[model samples]
Target: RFLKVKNWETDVVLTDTLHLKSTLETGCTEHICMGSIMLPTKDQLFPLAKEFLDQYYSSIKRFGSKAHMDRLEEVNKEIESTSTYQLKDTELIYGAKHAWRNASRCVGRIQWSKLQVFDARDCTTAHGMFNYICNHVKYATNKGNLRSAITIFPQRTDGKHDFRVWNSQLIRYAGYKQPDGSTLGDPANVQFTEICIQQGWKAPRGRFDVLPLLLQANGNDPELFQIPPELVLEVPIRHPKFDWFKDLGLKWYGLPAVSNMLLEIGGLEFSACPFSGWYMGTEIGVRDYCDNHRYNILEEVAKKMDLDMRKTSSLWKDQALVEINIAVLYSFQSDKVTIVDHHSATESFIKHMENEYRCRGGCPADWVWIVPPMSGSITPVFHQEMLNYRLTPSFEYQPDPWNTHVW
Candidate 1:
């Protein structure tokens, strides 16, 4: 009964609408099915569907067979409804919400009580642009000189700025837009090529931590229950570099791993089958309710310095000035490449695992090494042979993963 995944949605109403869309499209709109929160990190997929009738009306009214474009446009009208109605409710776009919330909260030396979290959809929105202070091609530095974030972006063939992503910049962002014909760097704003800086307050680069994927279901005809889900781990940095690249780690740390490994976390998601919402907690529901979660996956991991921000309670008040991709690595997945929730392994649990013949998720540290291209990617090909007798095959989400459609 190992279940799998597809993706995320916005609020209860909007998400339910999506559930309705999928199920209706597939037929069988009913109670959502359930899955574990420890979803497929990357190489994972799921299936829960509930396609409502609204999509039919929306598509036909907007354009024949154009899908939910009109519905999203309609949802964008209200400000209060921005949270639920917008795609910010999903894990992929959570970074935008996080960024916006962070931008708005920063007033002076002190940061806000809450960290903003958004999804990719919201981040690309007009409001999302404002959150980045896009108008400031050159913002004032702590010393009063204008700081240019553009210089940090990957360059184009024309020696001009090219679109860059949190970590990888081979292509623009997953769905980033060029912002019309406008070009930045007005030259007039610069005091020189000193690569100016920005002044006071904390600025944390945001990202989704929860992987918006689920374990695949075990059965025949699995493709019929597939979802077109897009997941990522955007790691934003002051300056981009592939630090954990296996060779780089071995060269620098000598221990064969990044001393303090950095990770970018975005958000999570679920589908509707018959009981999908049970495994996740409402406390983790911030991705749906919050508007400022969209984060540049790479930045938080390598900010110049901690913003040193704090709150009276644990609601992100004590968080660093520069928002992090995640609260912390939280905990490692025993000795394997996977990550786990419970760090303090109980005696019985540890004994059971140690006594067992094959327990993949919980392994000894020295035995397994988490590979590159973050998102906890492990070489699936090597997994079977390396741990065949000792551990179960481990699979994580990667930028490029082995294509093995499970049933």
Candidate 2:
């Protein structure tokens, strides 16, 4: 009988000889794990790199500057020769803005050019990651006046080094899967909470406890650090007409900063880049608060509004969803926190599409995400036919940082 060996970390099944060879050659940590790069998009490097180079040259000619002409030419030559290119500060800034513009899922691309880019690629330690993230939180939150910003960490090269911000956002609630088979907080975070607990991190007691930053630096075991309370801006959600609504204890953070997604600029993958923008009410109101997997507060909201929940014709869920979305916008506005409603948001997206057609020739958008969740057909984007394509400087989902699993 042949002996069998399996490495759980890398999901590698091997016979005795194969196991020894792999262990001796690449080691356990550097092993190429199955499902590591989930939904890997092949042939992305060439198109993305070429697009960045073309845009960089265009900007250089428009501004009439030769600050780094020689270096630009050198990078261009290397790209033509090897199909890989490096970006300098100017190109990186331009690419970051374009990445936001090319993000198919976003409806707020109108402010893409205004995104603040902070280059933190020199960050090497987990402690440094936490420090920079705290600064990012405070700066992006802007003490309730939110701003769009992103902090780019080091890029991934080969399999030797990888860094990732494990938390889905710089600020998010902890979800506790209770013994009674019910989730206490944000249900989406249950698996992450289990991982954090297994890793020796303690869970705080609250309905909306802010999760600490989990940073993985240099392909090492993840490290946990607490985010200071002062840096987070939470909006207390209350309705315009209902006094009892404030008693529901609903609240959300001011900034919608995504920390877990990978940022691919000109084929360079910044796996730990965290970016932020102001919320579009429906994201928090419909998906977060009313989705079945989330808080699932639609029924309670409808009952409070005195609608007949038993009758499908009553459109109770629809009515409740609209109210929740309205409250989110109203509360954010009252708190001096920036937020855009569905109508205003879609109108802005239309303008963005027009601007892109005039300047960049084409716009890439995913119609499903571009339209609001609640009133799809009623929105102007509902009638618009949008196409999705792979473009340079685009944001795409990557594998989960905690495990060798695909999401």
Candidate 3:
């Protein structure tokens, strides 16, 4: 009935070291080298996402969402093309469950642990599974039933874990009954043994005891910060889908041919929004430069607005999804040159769409002409045309969002 903010926090998850190096090399380069594209922002941006979301909302009435399975195809394409680097931090965002689904597809097969513990490949889903697995031993096994057990859930607005933006769910099982109460019960021993194995601990004196494993003092887990966290997440979600959904080269849930649509859509948004007060890391930085240039005005605004220095301090888009900056500081790293070029390219691409495709205001712009900044890096900016988006005002009784349905 109400929005509950249970899980809410922020953490900096870095990108792969190799990509980081590539990002560093190309990140600082200004896009001016790639020439300029003074494109229009009125339309031609993120047609894929719009298609997907429109179809997504529409699909709520259908069966078995091909959204995930369909998106998997696009993931495979990115992997084959080595374009996974294009996804901004938004790829790491699990606020929308399906977002990471496309990402995990590119990660392919790689697990830190097959039996018990492994690296948190899917940071978005990790917490959910972690809590579920923990709760199995934490409280699930002992709980009498679902109604009376300790329930764990995501710490997000709609109960969906938003990457590192919030916490995951954790449900607990409670009050198990043992056979050895008066005359003894065989069930107690059986459960204790099950829990011991489930928890990866040898049978100890306690009913359900386990060890708390921690990273070695150095915080060195080979894959800790090796690859982008979203890349890690994109791996597992599709592990099961492949068993059944074999990629269909067509559109499902309205998303276009699942090519590099996820990254492409994500990258476009990264570029576009900042133009309309929705700035990116680099753009925000530019704005901050402007702000610092007028430190007195900044101070005046703080005083006039009756705000504190904390709020008045210069603020730019934090590069991470957790914050709205243009720094590839998060898993999605882009260079300044790359940003300008990409931004220009994205705008240019959208401009072409107006005449070439006769596409509507809502659509994706292609940048095949403007070479991507670098293989492993993204510009702090993306397509410029995305800001032209406006809400389609209506009073129709659209599908009840709360009432979960399917397509």
* lDDT of every predicted structure (CA atoms): 0.19, 0.77, 0.23
Q: For residues 1-407, could you state the per-residue lDDT of candidate 2 as single tens digits?
A: 33343333335433322112111111113445322222433355555555556666766674324644555567667766765566688778888887788676788999999999998888999999999998888898887888899999888765447788888888889899888898899998988877778777878856798887888887777788998988888999999988888888999988888988878776788888899999989999999999999988988888888998888898888888888988999999999988888999998997787677557655666676787888887777777765444555767677787665222
Q: What ranking emerges by TM-score with the best candidate at the front? A: 2, 3, 1
2 or 3: which has the higher lDDT? 2
Ten contiguous residues with the weakest lDDT in model 3: 251-260
All models, RMSD in angstroms: 22.6, 13.1, 24.7
Please give the range of 10 consecutive residues that has the lowest summed lDDT in model 1: 250-259
TM values, all candidates: 0.18, 0.83, 0.18
TM-score, cand. 3: 0.18
Candidate 1 local lDDT, 74-141, one digit each (tens): 44343223322212233222322222212211111011112222122212222332223222211211
Candidate 2 matches the true fold with a TM-score of 0.83
Model 2 alpha-carbon drift over 4 Å, by segment = 1-51, 62-69, 76-86, 405-407
Q: Candidate 2 local accuracy as lDDT?
A: 0.77
